[PDB]
């Protein structure tokens, strides 16, 4: 019984055997077990290879075109604003198809407020994406609990400017002041201070993937040592008590 268990364990692991069946029935058992072991081990290796290959080819969304092509992850802008007009009057194929998906979508991917949009993105566990201003996205990404990320480049180009009444003496001096601040980098420093300084936010198999087999191996070594110690102690006590 112990030798049969050892033979079966060695056959499943495809390792060396000190014995082999000689009778016809024992050899039938050995042959069917060998075929089962071969099929099972090949299946395990192939399924692990498929797992790792599919993992390796996973492409995260990085562009607007990638978002446009795949439809698994929903995305939408606010119910109004400049994003609506930009998507409606955009003649680019990518943005036009984005808008066509946006308007004809159930349930409505549109959101009422920016805070509601970021909350929905947070609670959608990656199923819903948001399209919003890059500055607001960068500010949101640098806040607790560190779960939203701005991905890809800007779809369009806009700017924030200092507003003056038409026909006023403060227009041109403010314009030159803004240009000078841009040149010497005070604007970049302010952006860094108010967005990053005050923020609150491979291919090879790693050891973490196969840590369980190491734990099992060490546990088996310890168990074998304990069993050997128990047998040695029992034999020693029997020898001492016998004579």
């Amino acid at each position: 019984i112990f030798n049969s268990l050892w033979f079966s364990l060695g056959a499943f692991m495809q390792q060396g055997c000190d014995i082999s069946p000689r009778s016809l029935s024992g050899r039938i058992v050995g042959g069917v077990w060998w075929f089962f072991t071969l099929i099972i081990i090949s299946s395990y290796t192939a399924n692990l290879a498929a797992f790792l290959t599919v993992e390796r080819m996973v492409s995260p969304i990085e562009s607007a075109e990638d978002l446009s092509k795949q439809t698994e992850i929903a995305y939408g802008t606010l119910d109004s604003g400049s994003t609506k007009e930009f998507f409606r009057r955009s003649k680019i194929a990518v943005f036009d198809k984005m808008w066509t998906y946006m308007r004809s979508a159930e349930p409505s991917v549109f959101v009422r407020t920016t805070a509601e949009g970021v909350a929905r993105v947070r609670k959608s566990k990656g199923k819903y994406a948001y399209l919003l201003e890059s500055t607001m996205n960068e500010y949101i990404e640098q806040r607790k609990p560190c779960d939203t990320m701005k991905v890809g480049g800007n779809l369009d180009s806009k700017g924030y400017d200092i507003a003056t009444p038409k026909g006023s003496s403060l227009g041109t001096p403010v314009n030159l002041a803004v240009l000078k601040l841009s040149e010497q980098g005070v604007l970049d420093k302010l952006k860094n201070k108010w967005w990053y300084d005050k923020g609150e936010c491979t291919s090879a198999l790693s050891l973490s993937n196969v840590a369980g087999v190491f734990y099992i191996l060490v546990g088996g070594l310890g168990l074998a040592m304990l069993v050997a110690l128990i047998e040695f102690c029992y034999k020693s006590r029997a020898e001492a008590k016998r004579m």
Partner: protein
Amino acid sequence: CVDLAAEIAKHCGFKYKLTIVGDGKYGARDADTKIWNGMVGELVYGKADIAIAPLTITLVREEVIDFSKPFMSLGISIMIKKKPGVFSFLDPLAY
């Protein structure tokens, strides 16, 4: 915006008084009565003398008030939501 206003005042050598827009709106023309609101509307009716805020540069605002050169560029961008088990070597075959 406060720091940028301080820098602008220092460059132009003036003292400023900060006021928040009453309606809490950026400002948009209303087609029913052609009445401007928000900070752009406040500037149009002379309640304030200069707006230093995230005010997008648009044609409908440029034709009625003056805009300086942009101090911060932006655009539409995508925001998305962003470890193996110990016994993960048994994963290729079901339990």
